[PDB]
C-alpha cells in the first residue's frame, strides 16, 4: 500500500504535467491573440488581462 500510494503520487504529477502543458499554449496562444504586427487597443485588454 505504501508502494501503491507512491505510484498514485507519481501520476498526480503527470496529472499536473498534463494541466500545465495544456495550459502552456492556452496562455501562449492567448497572448498571441491580444496583439501582433497590427495592434489591439487597450481598454478591453483590461478584461483580457483580467481573464
Amino acid at each position: 500500500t505504501l508502494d501503491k500510494i507512491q505510484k498514485k503520487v507519481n501520476d498526480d504529477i503527470k496529472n499536473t504535467v498534463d494541466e500545465i502543458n495544456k495550459i502552456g499554449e492556452e496562455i501562449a496562444t492567448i497572448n498571441k491573440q491580444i496583439y501582433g504586427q497590427e495592434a489591439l487597443p487597450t481598454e478591453h485588454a483590461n478584461e483580457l488581462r483580467d481573464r
Binding site: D18, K22, E26, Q33, H44, E47, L48, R51
Partner: peptide, 17 residues
Amino acid sequence: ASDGENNNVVNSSNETL
C-alpha cells in the same frame, strides 16, 4: 472529461475577446 474541461475554458477564452 479533461478535454471538456479544456474546451470550456478555451471556449470561454474565445467568447470574451
